[PDB]
Amino acid sequence: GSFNFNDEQYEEFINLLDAPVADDPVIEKLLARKPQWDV
Amino acid sequence: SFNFNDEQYEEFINLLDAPVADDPVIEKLLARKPQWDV
């Protein structure tokens, strides 16, 4: 144990924990949908 | 705006504080039925 992280190791890790939370696949499809004005 | 009764409020708060969903790959791993419960 007791692994020691530099500033960007620690930051990468913190960003993985606090990362944009996932959602249900139907909701994920809705967010991924490319609308008829985005060509 | 909106007044919720105790059951309405509870359903709502349980939806907010509900566990975060898992990555679809990870969800498959958690759902896996392993070769020892055969």
Add this chain to the structure above:
Amino acid sequence: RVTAPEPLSAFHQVAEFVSGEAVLDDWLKQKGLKNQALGAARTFVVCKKDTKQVAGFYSLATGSVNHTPDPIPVIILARLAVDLSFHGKGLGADLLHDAVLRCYRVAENIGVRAIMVHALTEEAKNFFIHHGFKSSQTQQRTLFLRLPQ
């Protein structure tokens, strides 16, 4: 083949807008601009390209949930409508896409916790269920979508 959503202005032509739900069509024509100016509700429209004729729209409004604990802020997706000329052409889901992403950005800046919907018909309810909204089992035709954080 339709323009990107833009905030409702007095220059948008909404007089000949027909969705199939007259309550929504009447709100747009008679209350859209007033609420835009009051800030009570924010309406976004899509137009036929190279025109200002409204093909579809939705309205976002701020609300709060209280217990009969300080109030919990939510966004109300008050309205979403497509003109009958554009029905079943995937525009309704394109507007819901835009509406939900917009509510994600609002959540990041003021911390609203959920999108709330009060469906008028039970067919409207199933439009939202089909796109990942959760149906309240303690209230009729009320749906929720949890927002990040």
Add this chain to the structure above:
Amino acid sequence: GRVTAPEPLSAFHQVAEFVSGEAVLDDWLKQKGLKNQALGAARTFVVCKKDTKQVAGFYSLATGSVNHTMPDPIPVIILARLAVDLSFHGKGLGADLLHDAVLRCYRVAENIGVRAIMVHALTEEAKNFFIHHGFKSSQTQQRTLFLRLPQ
């Protein structure tokens, strides 16, 4: 043939004839497994051939922390080891052990609040086994992977 449900490594388990393909893991099991089990340094779960105590596969969970030297502590679970005996390769046992290991770390997270599983991959074929099952590859350290745990 058939294999037993995971159980904690005990003195009754036969580990002398265990070969995974990675010698460092096989040596740790035979020479350090029981001692660390008793000390509580790392905690090893084994699957055996049914009606037997011969180890077909195992993994080790250990508690660790992510630190900055002002005050920045954070507990994590270390998946220190995961190995299948070459006799049991391509029977889906490696993924069955990872399934068990991750569920176990979910239950640990519910009770002590560890934030993530950390994995230090030795071979780069092992790295891609974890990526294939949802683990995220660190870009600031080579062969280090993470899985966020609930809460």
